[PDB]
Amino acid sequence: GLFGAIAGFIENGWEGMIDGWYGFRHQNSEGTGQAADLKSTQAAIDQINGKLNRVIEKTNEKFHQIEKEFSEVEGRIQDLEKYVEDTKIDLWSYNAELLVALENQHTIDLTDSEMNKLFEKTRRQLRENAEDMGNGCFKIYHKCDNACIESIRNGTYDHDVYRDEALNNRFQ
Amino acid sequence: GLFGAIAGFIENGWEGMIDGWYGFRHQNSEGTGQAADLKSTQAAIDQINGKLNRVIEKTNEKFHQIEKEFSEVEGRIQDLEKYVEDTKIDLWSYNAELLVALENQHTIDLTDSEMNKLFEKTRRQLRENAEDMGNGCFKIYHKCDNACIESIRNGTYDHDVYRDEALNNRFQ
Amino acid sequence: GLFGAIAGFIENGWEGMIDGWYGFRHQNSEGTGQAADLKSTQAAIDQINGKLNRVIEKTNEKFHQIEKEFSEVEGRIQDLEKYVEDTKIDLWSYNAELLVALENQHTIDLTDSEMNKLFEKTRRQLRENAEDMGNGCFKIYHKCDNACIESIRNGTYDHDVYRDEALNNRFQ
Amino acid sequence: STATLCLGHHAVPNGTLVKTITDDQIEVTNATELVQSSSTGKICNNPHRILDGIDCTLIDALLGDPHCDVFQNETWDLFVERSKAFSNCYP
Amino acid sequence: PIDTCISECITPNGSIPNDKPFQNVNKITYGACPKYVKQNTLKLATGMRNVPEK
Ligand SMILES: *[C@@H]1O[C@H](CO)[C@@H](O[C@@H]2O[C@H](CO)[C@@H](O)[C@H](O)[C@H]2NC(C)=O)[C@H](O)[C@H]1NC(C)=O
Numbered sequence: 001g002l003f004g005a006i007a008g009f010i011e012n013g014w015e016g017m018i019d020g021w022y023g024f025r026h027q028n029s030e031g032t033g034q035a036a037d038l039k040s041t042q043a044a045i046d047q048i049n050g051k052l053n054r055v056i057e058k059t060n061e062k063f064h065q066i067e068k069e070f071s072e073v074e075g076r077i078q079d080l081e082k083y084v085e086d087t088k089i090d091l092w093s094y095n096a097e098l099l100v101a102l103e104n105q106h107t108i109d110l111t112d113s114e115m116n117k118l119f120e121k122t123r124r125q126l127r128e129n130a131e132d133m134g135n136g137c138f139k140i141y142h143k144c145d146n147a148c149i150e151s152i153r154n155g156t157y158d159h160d161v162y163r164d165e166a167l168n169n170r171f172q
Numbered sequence: 173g174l175f176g177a178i179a180g181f182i183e184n185g186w187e188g189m190i191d192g193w194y195g196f197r198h199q200n201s202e203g204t205g206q207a208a209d210l211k212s213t214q215a216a217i218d219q220i221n222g223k224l225n226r227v228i229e230k231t232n233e234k235f236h237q238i239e240k241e242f243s244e245v246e247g248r249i250q251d252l253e254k255y256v257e258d259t260k261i262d263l264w265s266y267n268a269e270l271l272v273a274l275e276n277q278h279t280i281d282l283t284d285s286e287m288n289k290l291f292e293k294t295r296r297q298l299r300e301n302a303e304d305m306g307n308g309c310f311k312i313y314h315k316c317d318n319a320c321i322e323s324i325r326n327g328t329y330d331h332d333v334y335r336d337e338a339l340n341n342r343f344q
Numbered sequence: 345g346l347f348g349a350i351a352g353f354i355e356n357g358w359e360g361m362i363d364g365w366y367g368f369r370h371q372n373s374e375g376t377g378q379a380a381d382l383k384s385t386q387a388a389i390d391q392i393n394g395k396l397n398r399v400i401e402k403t404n405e406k407f408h409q410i411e412k413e414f415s416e417v418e419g420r421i422q423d424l425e426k427y428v429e430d431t432k433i434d435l436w437s438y439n440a441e442l443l444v445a446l447e448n449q450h451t452i453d454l455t456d457s458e459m460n461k462l463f464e465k466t467r468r469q470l471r472e473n474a475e476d477m478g479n480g481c482f483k484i485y486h487k488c489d490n491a492c493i494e495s496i497r498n499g500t501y502d503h504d505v506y507r508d509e510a511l512n513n514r515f516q
Numbered sequence: 517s518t519a520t521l522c523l524g525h526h527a528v529p530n531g532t533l534v535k536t537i538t539d540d541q542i543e544v545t546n547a548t549e550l551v552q553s554s555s556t557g558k559i560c561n562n563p564h565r566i567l568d569g570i571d572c573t574l575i576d577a578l579l580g581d582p583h584c585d586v587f588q589n590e591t592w593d594l595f596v597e598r599s600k601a602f603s604n605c606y607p
Numbered sequence: 608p609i610d611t612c613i614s615e616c617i618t619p620n621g622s623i624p625n626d627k628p629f630q631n632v633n634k635i636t637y638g639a640c641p642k643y644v645k646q647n648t649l650k651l652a653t654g655m656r657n658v659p660e661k
């Protein structure tokens with residue numbers, strides 16, 4: 001949650017969103033519509049799909065080791081074996097705990113980053129024709145029908161052909 | 173310092189700020205005033221209060237171990253005991269060093285993130301009635317008395333009732 | 345790549361840039377020019393120059409250890425020695441892998457952060473006289489000759505003396 | 517005709533230097549020591565059952581050295597063995 | 608010497624508090640003890656980066 005997008009100014013997840021992880025909801029004259037952004041969702045999924053094979057490539061293969069359970073009491077050698085095994089177990093338990101915590105923190109920051117990146121990209125497309133309302137939603141200041149909205153989602157939005165009307169609506 | 177807020181465009185800490193970690197200083201017709209933002213401060217403090225119990229839950233309890241100091245010279249077994257203890261000490265020293273470095277870096281990024289989040293939230297409230305001066309301070313383009321300022325700090329600022337005057341002052 | 349600057353909205357590296365890591369390319373009436381930003385480059389280089397001495401200060405000095413190669417077959421003691429050495433090797437290999445992955449991820453995020461910081465600083469200098477075109481490039485809406493451009497790069501840009509012309513050009 | 521609203525963060529007159537991934541020494545408002553490097557010099561007798569072995573080693577108390585007769589049937593959580601301990605029975 | 612007091616972690620140097628995660632007193636320990644490290648000091652930041660005036 002470094003960027004304040006998820007659990008930040010977005011304030012709410014969409015349980016009706018099943019197509020992807022990130023997407024748009026638009027309300028215009030025609031009516032409400034919803035879509036998912038496949039590119040951001042795929043970026044996040046790709047950055048999450050591994051994330052454990054990149055640190056622990058595979059299970060190491062161990063065949064013959066020391067004894068770790070003892071019936072009788074010997075003394076020095078049994079104590080050394082127990083100490084070695086306990087030290088190994090403690091170190092690997094710490095490794096597992098730290099790795100899980102670090103990866104979870106990075107995954108949260110990563111998804112929040114993808115959300116913020118989508119927001120900034122959408123804002124940059126809507127150069128002067130829209131204003132950020134502060135709740136993750138843009139108020140677009142011109143007639144923006146379904147083709148306009150899909151162009152925004154597509155990435156081929158042309159801010160120039162609406163700039164006059166948008167400026168006239170914003171600054172009066 | 174990933175966002176460039178702290179030791180970035182803010183450029184300076186307030187030694188007169190003792191109420192909280194993050195806050196506002198405002199100058200208007202009435203006069204200078206100062207307040208602290210409790211929500212951002214509490215968020216940062218909550219994310220910092222633990223941060224070590226989340227990786228090392230508690231001290232592990234160890235009762236009977238190997239000998240780690242020797243009077244005479246035996247040979248193989250003493251060498252193995254010394255090697256085991258030295259290996260454990262080196263691994264845990266590395267763990268401590270890496271954990272401290274990682275946590276310090278994350279804490280710095282975290283506090284810088286909270287500062288940037290407060291800045292962006294304040295900017296989003298002041299939709300078109302204010303301009304970022306670039307030093308972490310907003311120039312608000314209308315009569316903003318103490319009630320106006322506290323509404324900005326509160327979060328219930330209503331940009332619509334000042335929008336005409338603010339646009340008239342900005343764009344002439 | 346948390347901020348979406350590098351491999352994001354910048355979309356392309358400059359192979360003609362050899363003066364520094366981050367810089368400006370400007371096109372105006374006089375003609376195209378290019379320069380490097382020494383401050384951001386130095387910040388990134390300083391944050392990268394160490395980054396391994398801060399976790400592993402030096403090589404530890406080890407003189408007499410256990411035997412790690414054996415000719416004959418003894419039994420318990422040889423098995424314990426092999427187990428201890430194999431455990432140490434596995435733990436240090438994991439440490440190396442995790443450290444390299446973490447440092448590489450942080451270095452990528454760090455350089456992307458420096459790029460975004462330079463972008464935001466430049467945007468904040470150009471308060472209302474420029475507009476972000478969305479590809480990491482600013483459209484400045486006034487006569488900005490070489491002295492103007494170098495003032496932007498310098499940090500002493502004075503947005504007030506161009507504000508009238510820039511607003512007249514933007515909002516017509 | 518306008519107002520001004522500045523945003524900032526608190527500072528302290530003197531700060532603690534910590535080490536991060538990217539800095540050998542960076543100053544922060546507050547910091548906590550994580551390594552305990554000092555001791556009181558005395559062994560607390562609770563909650564563990566401490567058995568101070570005065571002049572006796574564990575093996576001498578086990579065998580039944582005369583000057584160790586006070587350690588008969590003793591129990592401990594930690595047997596503290598002193599450097600002044602000596603044997604005074606059959607070699 | 609033995610003393611009348613409460614402490615969970617005992618070293619040959621005496622009892623030490625176990626509130627800190629690491630210790631540099633002695634590698635020989637008994638009870639709920641902090642892990643022994645070679646570093647004599649490790650500062651954990653519990654605040655923001657300090658930027659004073661001027
Ligand atoms: C830095 O944080 C530490 C940890 O809480 C603070 O130290 C405590 O301060 C309170 C003051 O009310 C004392 O009652 C505690 O005994 C202190 N604990 C320790 C372990 O020293 C310290 O005050 C903080 N520093 C600043 C400048 O806020």
Ligand SMILES: *[C@@H]1O[C@H](CO)[C@@H](O)[C@H](O)[C@H]1NC(C)=O
Binds near residue numbers: 150154156
């Ligand atoms: C989206 O953009 C692509 C490429 O510019 C184009 O081929 C397509 O027709 C656009 N509209 C869609 C996919 O609805």
Ligand SMILES: *[C@@H]1O[C@H](CO)[C@@H](O)[C@H](O)[C@H]1NC(C)=O
Binds near residue numbers: 322326328
């Ligand atoms: C701040 O907002 C809250 C909730 O909207 C309101 O109850 C309060 O009166 C406001 N002003 C303050 C706390 O000065």
Ligand SMILES: *[C@@H]1O[C@H](CO)[C@@H](O)[C@H](O)[C@H]1NC(C)=O
Binds near residue numbers: 494500
């Ligand atoms: C850049 O700024 C500095 C300090 O304000 C000034 O001395 C210098 O003349 C400026 N121009 C340059 C370096 O071209």
Ligand SMILES: *[C@@H]1O[C@H](CO)[C@@H](O)[C@H](O)[C@H]1NC(C)=O
Binds near residue numbers: 529530
């Ligand atoms: C605290 O601040 C004073 C002056 O503000 C300074 O002289 C001193 O070195 C700082 N640290 C301590 C531990 O007093």
